[PDB]
């Protein structure tokens, strides 16, 4: 398009700008405190409707009483005073959606806080909308590669499911999310739209310094071009932390309804319950068990239930949710964690013991489970993933006998050693996602027992050297595993012969 | 003509201001001007011509003063064969997109349970194809059945297997009421029944009804959609003396939904935050699910155990109403045994030497005593080991593990997860297989073969095959 043609269309667009104003009812605030504003009059106001105060900050009318109206301040409530004016906008809470959202950082309401420039978007969707029915949904049959060996192998995540990243503080909950975003960057560069996955990161009750560090990492790896960050910090009012999850969820429905694939990552929801509890307690509502409101279960259920795999009739889009939960002392019997577990499909348990013992990612495969199961894994993965689980199951049992000692059968020594190779194999550093095909090769060598030869401390370095060696000399093999997604017999023979050979060539500690 | 009008809207609770002729409690009110049909169930009369109701749909978009129409009757849902093979909403709307539902008449979801004089209780063994169930906790046709399980223990897959084994080949009709569960499972079950020919588009077929109150529905709807499914079963029971198979998904969501609004309703929280009317609210539902002179209902209802805490008031009160109980244990799943049916906790009212054959009762207790003894030996074995035990204890531990591993049975619904085709076990083969193990028929062969097998013969043939293989 020539510069002149675009400018003419640009001028014509500015010409066609309409602005209509109608009579809008307004009311006075009876009282204001802790962000709650009691408004007098202001009748014929809809629940959840947006209202604007004198200063210009917005509000949401939640409690509609015959006497007054309970409004929540969507911002700083220092300027609010008794008798101030409250104007109803006439529209339910909504946020901007579109493709321009990618590459920016917004707040709970959707305003960009990066400071780059105004948001150029024209589509706005309501924050809270009824989830899809039963027919629009569809069975999850597409893998969502996170880049982690243990996850992509033991706990496969299919696009359209709900996996719970549950763990204690500083247990690697955020590390898992970051590794996933970094893994999807490769698929974004290559022209494979069927595997592009837009990432959405919802930050609820987190220090801005940490979120700032988070965004820098994305830009460092150039993974921010397809990432959306919603920020609801601690200083932000409780309603913002309450709406930020639903706000980001609405942005995901855009890609979902448009046949696209989007990944939304909800940070710690316990912080949302505190804000939602705080917001409910200040409204003088009767509290429930643990001081939380009675409908706290409906809160997360309504939010997570929206993530689904739309059918081909609507475009085949999908929305994947990865809610996070922080535990106090690893007690999953609490009220909030128990509810979230029953809502999501699978859950990833993080153990502090495994973390300090060198098992990073500290994943407890014994408890982790996924409804989709092998239905998401690729052909080359299901075959190897099956035996991997069984081998690890036996190793966890013989762990105690090691203390008993005083004797060890030949087979038990092998099974004990074999399992040690897998645990050492599944370990992975931070900010180091692996390709799906590369994991197949490494995981294959482990179950076959080849790793039992070299010393355990050398298995981790062998992984790097082995993969690099394959990428250079054996490139057609990797291409077949990627394109076809199946481990053919010809690849088995070739792979089964080069794995023992390579170990002998390279300089490693062969003594078991 | 609308008599009432919206006056107060907070969360899911909505109050209506009537001018005269207040509607009776439990009546269904129609709000006019809403984008979607909203129904309000009268629950309390607060005086001054005021009534407090619960909204079945999202209250967002409502407006104070909006006219409300009084129907004069509780929420009525379509009943009859037209609902068979179709998904229906809490208020009776078809959400399957297959068109309107044809019903010969409309019945109310609220009714008094049948009297005691016309109870007509009866016991009849129900061969479900599961050896562990048919042996330790036999089910009774026309009696309540409970599946107590935690979060992610295998109770949903078990319900699917019972449907695949019990619902099909059933002369009578069947009803499936899924309340509070995730919607993904609903779409899977719908496609499963369609592929399995349990439901079809061709009229005169699909002898099975589906009702869904999934999480996507707001409070109040999940607590009353269960009554909708029950009304369908009641119609097939009273109008026709046909055995009805009522497959109720997790019911804990019903009592939970009531507590979600009990606080706003004005009730004082209970010891664990539940409503004071938990026993009465739950009792009204259980008493209605029972066999009568007209027809019988074999209800298969699951109870979700939050945090694996069986002391919760909701499930604790349910045990008293259930005839057969199936408590799922998480320890078994860790071992790989499926179905993870707890043999000691699971009980059945039919487990009586007079009701069932003495041989069936004998083999049942023989397994329970065997496993109970093995559980006690675990303590000493941890320190000293099985070697330090006596020959008598060694044999007990040996057979106990073989029987415990043999309880595992792969079903058709578990093929996708395990990859082994399902299998059906008869009652005769079931009692004979375990009875032989109790006598030591399989004590010689390794315990590895007594895993995920249907019959004892299958395990022996597999054992011999492994021998020639090596």
């Amino acid at each position: 398009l020539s510069t002149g043609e675009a400018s003419v269309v640009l001028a014509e667009k500015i010409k066609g700008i309409t602005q209509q104003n109608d009579i809008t009812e307004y009311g006075t605030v009876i009282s204001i405190g802790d962000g709650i504003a009691r408004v007098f009059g202001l009748t014929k106001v809809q629940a959840g409707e947006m209202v604007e105060f004198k200063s210009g900050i917005r509000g949401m009318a939640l409690n509609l009483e015959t006497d007054n109206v309970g409004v929540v301040v969507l911002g700083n409530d220092r300027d609010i005073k008794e008798g101030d004016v409250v104007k109803r906008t006439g529209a339910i809470v909504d946020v901007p959606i579109g493709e321009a959202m990618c590459g920016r950082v917004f707040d709970a309401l959707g305003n960009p806080i990066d400071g780059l420039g105004p948001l150029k978007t024209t589509q706005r969707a309501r924050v809270e909308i009824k989830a899809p029915g039963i027919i629009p949904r569809q069975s999850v049959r597409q893998p969502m590669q996170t880049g982690i060996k243990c996850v992509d192998s033991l706990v496969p995540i299919g696009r359209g499911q709900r996996e719970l990243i549950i763990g204690d503080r500083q247990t690697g909950k955020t590390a898992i999310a970051i590794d996933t975003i970094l893994n999807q960057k490769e698929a974004f560069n290559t022209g494979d739209v069927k595997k592009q996955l837009y990432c959405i990161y919802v930050a609820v009750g987190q220090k801005r310094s940490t979120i700032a560090n988070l965004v820098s990492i994305l830009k460092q790896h150039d993974c921010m071009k397809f990432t959306i960050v919603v920020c609801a910090t601690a200083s932000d009012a409780a309603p913002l932390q309450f709406l930020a999850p639903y706000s980001g969820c609405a942005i995901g429905e855009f890609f979902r309804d448009n046949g696209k694939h989007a990944l939304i990552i909800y940070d710690d929801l316990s912080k949302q319950a505190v804000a939602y509890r705080q917001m409910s307690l200040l409204l003088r509502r009767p509290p429930g068990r643990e001081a939380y409101p009675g409908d706290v279960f409906y809160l997360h259920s309504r939010l997570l239930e929206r993530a689904a795999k739309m059918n081909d009739s609507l475009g085949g889009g999908s929305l994947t949710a990865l809610p996070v939960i922080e535990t106090q002392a690893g007690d999953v019997s609490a009220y909030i964690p128990t509810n979230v577990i029953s809502i999501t499909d699978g859950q990833i348990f993080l153990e502090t013991e495994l973390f300090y013992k060198g098992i990073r990612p500290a994943i407890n495969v014994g408890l982790s489970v996924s409804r989709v199961g092998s239905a998401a894994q690729i052909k080359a993965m299901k075959k190897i993933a099956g035996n991997l689980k069984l081998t690890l199951a036996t190793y966890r049992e013989l762990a105690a006998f090691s203390q008993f000692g005083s004797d060890l059968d030949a087979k038990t020594q092998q099974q004990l050693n074999t399992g040690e190779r897998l645990v050492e194999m599944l370990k992975q550093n931070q900010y180091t996602p692996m390709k799906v095909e590369e994991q197949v090769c490494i995981i294959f060598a482990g179950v076959k027992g080849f790793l039992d030869a070299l010393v355990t401390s050398e298995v981790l370095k062998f992984e790097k050297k082995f993969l690099e060696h394959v990428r250079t000399n054996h490139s057609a093999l990797l291409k077949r595993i990627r394109d076809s997604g199946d481990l053919s017999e010809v690849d088995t023979n070739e792979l089964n012969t080069i794995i023992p050979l390579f170990i002998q060539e390279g300089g490693f500690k062969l003594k078991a | 003509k609308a008599n009432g009008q919206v006056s107060q809207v907070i969360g899911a609770v909505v109050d209506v201001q009537f001018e005269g002729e207040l509607p009776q409690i439990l009546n269904a009110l129609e709000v006019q001007g809403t984008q979607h049909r909203l129904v309000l169930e009268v629950a309390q009369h607060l005086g001054d011509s005021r009534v407090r109701t619960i909204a079945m749909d999202s209250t967002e978009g409502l407006v104070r003063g909006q006219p409300v129409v009084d129907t004069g009757l509780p929420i009525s849902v379509p009943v009859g064969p037209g609902t068979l093979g179709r998904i229906m909403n809490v208020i009776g709307e078809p959400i399957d997109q297959r068109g309107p539902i044809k019903a010969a008449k409309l019945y109310p979801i609220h009714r008094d349970a049948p009297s005691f004089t016309d109870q007509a209780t009866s016991a009849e063994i129900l061969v479900t194809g599961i050896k562990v169930v048919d042996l330790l906790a036999p089910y009774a046709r026309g009696g309540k059945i409970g599946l107590f399980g935690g979060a992610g223990v295998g109770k949903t897959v078990l319900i699917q297997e019972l449907i695949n084994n019990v619902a099909k080949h059933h002369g009578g009709y069947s009803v499936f009421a899924g309340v509070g569960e995730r919607t993904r499972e609903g779409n899977d079950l719908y496609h499963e029944m369609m592929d399995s020919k349990v439901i079809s588009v061709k009229e005169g077929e699909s002898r099975c009804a589906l009702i869904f109150g999934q999480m996507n529905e707001p409070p109040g709807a999940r607590a009353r959609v269960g009554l909708t499914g029950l009304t369908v079963a009641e119609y097939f029971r009273d109008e026709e003396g046909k055995d009805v198979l009522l497959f109720v998904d997790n019911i804990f969501r019903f009592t939970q939904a009531c507590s979600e609004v009990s606080a706003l309703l004005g009730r004082i929280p209970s010891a664990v935050g539940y409503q004071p009317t938990l026993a009465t609210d739950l009792g009204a539902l259980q008493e209605r699910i029972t066999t009568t002179q007209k027809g019988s209902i074999t209800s298969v209802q699951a109870i979700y155990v939050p945090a694996d805490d069986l002391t919760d008031p909701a499930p604790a009160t349910t045990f008293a109403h259930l005839d057969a109980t199936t408590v799922l244990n998480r320890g078994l799943t860790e071992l790989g045994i499926y179905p993870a049916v707890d043999p000691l906790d699971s009980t059945s009212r039919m487990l009586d030497p007079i009701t069932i054959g003495e041989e069936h009762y004998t083999v049942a207790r023989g397994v329970q005593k065997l496993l109970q003894d093995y559980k006690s030996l675990q303590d000493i074995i941890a320190i000293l080991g099985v070697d330090d035990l006596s020959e008598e204890d060694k044999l007990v531990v040996a057979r106990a593990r073989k029987v415990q591993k043999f309880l595992s049975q792969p079903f058709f619904m578990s093929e996708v997860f395990s990859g082994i085709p399902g299998r059906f076990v008869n009652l005769k083969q079931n009692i004979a297989s375990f009875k032989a193990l109790l006598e030591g028929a399989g004590d010689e062969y390794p315990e590895s073969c007594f895993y995920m097998k249907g019959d004892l013969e299958e395990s022996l043939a597999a054992g011999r095959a492994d021998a020639l293989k090596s």
Binding site: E397, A400 | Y445
Partner: peptide, 27 residues
């Protein structure tokens, strides 16, 4: 601080080792 798991693992561990050899003889 989890001693129940220690006893549980010791039980399954020794039993598996003990019966693993018995499986060989049985075969």
């Amino acid at each position: 601080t989890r001693e129940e798991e220690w006893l549980d693992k010791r039980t399954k561990s020794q039993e598996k080792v003990y019966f693993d050899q018995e499986d060989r003889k049985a075969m």
